[PDB]
Amino acid sequence: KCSLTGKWTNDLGSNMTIGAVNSRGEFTGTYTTAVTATSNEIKESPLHGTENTINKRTQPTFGFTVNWKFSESTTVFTGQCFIDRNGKEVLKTMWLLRSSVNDIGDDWKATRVGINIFTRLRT
Amino acid sequence: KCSLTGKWTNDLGSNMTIGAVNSRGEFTGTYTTAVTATSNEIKESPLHGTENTINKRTQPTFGFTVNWKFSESTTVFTGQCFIDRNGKEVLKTMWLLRSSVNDIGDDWKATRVGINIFTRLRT
Amino acid sequence: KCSLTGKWTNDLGSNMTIGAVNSRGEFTGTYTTAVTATSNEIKESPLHGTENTINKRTQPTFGFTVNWKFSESTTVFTGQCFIDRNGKEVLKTMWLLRSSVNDIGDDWKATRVGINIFTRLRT
Amino acid sequence: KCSLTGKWTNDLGSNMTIGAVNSRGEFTGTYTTAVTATSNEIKESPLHGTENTINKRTQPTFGFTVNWKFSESTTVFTGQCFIDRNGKEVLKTMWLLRSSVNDIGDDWKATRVGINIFTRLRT
Ligand SMILES: *[C@@H]1O[C@H](CO)[C@@H](O)[C@H](O)[C@H]1NC(C)=O
Numbered sequence: 321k322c323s324l325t326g327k328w329t330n331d332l333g334s335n336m337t338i339g340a341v342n343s344r345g346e347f348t349g350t351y352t353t354a355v356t357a358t359s360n361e362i363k364e365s366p367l368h369g370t371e372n373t374i375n376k377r378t379q380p381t382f383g384f385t386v387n388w389k390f391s392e393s394t395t396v397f398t399g400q401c402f403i404d405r406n407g408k409e410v411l412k413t414m415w416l417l418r419s420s421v422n423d424i425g426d427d428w429k430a431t432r433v434g435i436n437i438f439t440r441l442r443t
Numbered sequence: 444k445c446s447l448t449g450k451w452t453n454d455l456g457s458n459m460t461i462g463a464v465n466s467r468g469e470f471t472g473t474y475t476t477a478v479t480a481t482s483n484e485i486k487e488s489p490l491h492g493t494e495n496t497i498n499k500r501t502q503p504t505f506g507f508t509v510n511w512k513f514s515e516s517t518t519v520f521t522g523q524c525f526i527d528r529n530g531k532e533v534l535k536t537m538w539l540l541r542s543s544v545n546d547i548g549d550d551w552k553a554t555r556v557g558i559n560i561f562t563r564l565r566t
Numbered sequence: 567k568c569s570l571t572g573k574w575t576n577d578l579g580s581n582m583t584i585g586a587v588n589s590r591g592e593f594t595g596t597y598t599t600a601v602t603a604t605s606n607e608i609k610e611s612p613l614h615g616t617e618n619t620i621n622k623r624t625q626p627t628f629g630f631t632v633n634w635k636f637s638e639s640t641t642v643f644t645g646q647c648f649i650d651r652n653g654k655e656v657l658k659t660m661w662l663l664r665s666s667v668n669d670i671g672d673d674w675k676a677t678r679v680g681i682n683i684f685t686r687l688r689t
Numbered sequence: 690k691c692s693l694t695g696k697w698t699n700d701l702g703s704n705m706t707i708g709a710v711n712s713r714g715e716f717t718g719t720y721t722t723a724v725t726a727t728s729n730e731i732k733e734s735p736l737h738g739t740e741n742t743i744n745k746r747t748q749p750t751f752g753f754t755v756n757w758k759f760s761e762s763t764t765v766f767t768g769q770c771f772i773d774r775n776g777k778e779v780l781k782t783m784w785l786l787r788s789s790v791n792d793i794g795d796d797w798k799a800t801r802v803g804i805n806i807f808t809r810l811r812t
Pocket residue numbers: 329333334335352353354
């Protein structure tokens with residue numbers, strides 16, 4: 321039921337468009353983040369994901385990576401596609417944002433965490 | 444300088460292998476984990492990732508998603524590839540391991556978080 | 567403006583109650599969780615916390631530790647107390663829920679991470 | 690066996706001194722962090738914790754909060770006290786660092802995560 325394929329929106333108002341999945345559960349798409357942590361003109365950026373195939377079909381877990389075209393960072397999302405009842409799909413995801421640092425010494429503070437809620441876009 | 448391409452081993456005995464790396468930053472690979480949260484014999488699994496090429500640094504950040512073959516769960520990693528003083532490449536990484544719940548009421552207890560340091564296996 | 571002192575409820579039906587608040591920032595309280603990762607009847611548990619008073623902001627950050635009475639685990643929370651537009655105080659919070667492993671080889675799989683938004687219960 | 694009480698050190702070289710625990714498993718102590726995320730003269734700061742009492746004695750989980758006297762943030766640690774074999778104690782902890790933001794709007798990026806290893810101090 322729960323199909324990643326399509327267009328979704330967030331609670332911060334971010335939007336994401338996701339291609340078609342495969343036998344291997346692969347997919348690609350694009351991301352437009354509403355917010356940034358960098359002082360630097362936001363752009364549409366790419367994602368590469370995967371969606372689990374094993375028997376838990378109905379509501380699968382998944383995860384993608386986003387390659388900021390406008391910053392030196394990377395973000396990764398992972399979560400589950402749910403169907404409340406209505407037949408309303410919801411992505412419940414949690415993500416990790418890695419920033420660039422110049423010496424391993426700094427590594428310690430390069431990782432931020434948090435959530436995101438996605439539901440789909442009309443029309 | 445620091446590249447994803449190759450065989451790597453991490454502090455827990457897990458090994459993975461990367462390869463591709465478009466001019467995009469995309470790469471696929473396989474990952475063989477030493478460990479698990481599940482009670483099913485481990486099987487090589489595939490991974491999909493990306494490398495940041497913005498302001499082409501000698502230590503880019505990255506991130507990948509491991510689509511577990513033996514489980515219904517998913518793991519995502521992000522980090523940086525640094526060039527340590529020894530002259531050695533080190534992957535400092537962090538992750539979320541998302542597993543499946545049967546109901547969206549149990550979401551809150553589905554995501555684990557941890558660290559991993561990768562090193563080159565090849566001699 | 568925003569103070570920890572009181573009864574609060576969060577998006578999962580859990581309630582807690584704070585009280586103290588030295589000139590230090592220390593406070594104790596009790597917490598009654600609606601939810602659990604364990605299979606043992608829940609019992610009110612105590613908490614110990616602190617409030618930042620550096621550059622006495624109207625929205626200080628804080629953090630507390632809930633010493634579960636019904637479990638062998640521990641939870642820690644941190645966040646900020648904000649004054650929302652409505653004029654309402656909101657506790658935006660994030661947590662780690664650490665549980666016990668019998669062997670240090672299983673460490674890597676012991677810590678969960680999540681979010682919680684607290685609101686005032688009192689009328 | 691594993692007693693929080695005493696003086697410990699970190700992998701980043703941070704030191705911490707921990708008072709005596711109670712029946713309620715409480716404790717207090719002081720922290721000297723080797724590193725900071727703020728441009729602001731490091732100081733010895735206080736912690737308030739708790740250490741679980743329920744039957745899992747030998748190696749207990751625990752958690753403390755640190756009230757930076759020199760910044761607007763808070764950090765929280767939670768983890769387990771281990772005894773490899775030697776009779777060497779090790780704290781394996783993971784922590785959450787909350788920074789101050791000026792509008793709930795920003796909340797999204799105020800949380801950093803990571804680890805820390807503690808072993809004790811001679812003499
Ligand atoms: C997301 O899509 C909606 C649909 O109309 C649009 O109004 C909004 O501006 C988009 N926002 C971003 C940040 O892409």
